[PDB]
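This week, study the protein below.
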Amino acid sequence: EMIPLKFFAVDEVSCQINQEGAPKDVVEKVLFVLNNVTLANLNNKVDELKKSLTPNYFSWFSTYLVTQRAKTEPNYHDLYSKVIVAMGSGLLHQFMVNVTLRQLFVLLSTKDEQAIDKKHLKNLASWLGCITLALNKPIKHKNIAFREMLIEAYKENRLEIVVPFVTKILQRASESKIFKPPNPWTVGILKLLIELNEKANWKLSLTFEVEVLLKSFNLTTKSLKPSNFI
């Protein structure tokens, strides 16, 4: 059972290259790379990956990496993001973001909050930030309207789902370059989170998530003024 998400939308990937499932020998080679890649051997490993993972397998690889690895292996987010960067394909990156958005959509749209694995949610949110904001690439307003999503979640009593999704994404702006405060978009979201902290009468763990986020930017609650949307 699902609920509508007014302020979250997934677009289709534009692609002229026919997509196929990877054959057993390609899967074997790809898994070998993923299981043995380190910061030290990254460049050579990506060279090896390119010989096997041709563009007709980009959708397969994105679905695989996001659903089988990124969703459950937060310690490898930085490394996997570096692999995607090294591959040098905009199309691959688009598929990676697309699958991530679709997976996030399913979780955020699940009506029963007890049926949402909170760690999977936080992992996918952090991963999204890793392959967008942390690479100085935006998350488009047409896909996620963050301020509207937060205000709607307040109205619909969904902050326990939406807040950690927002904070785990936004923390990835902390070393960005483009998206660190005083970036007004980033700061705007922080100001609304501070307002909600004051007004929502929410669970302690949400206060914790906001505190952790502010700290990542070397900011405190006292350093910002709350918005007044609520």
Observations:
- Residues 90-108 form the longest helix (19 residues).
- The two ends are 29 Å apart (CA to CA).
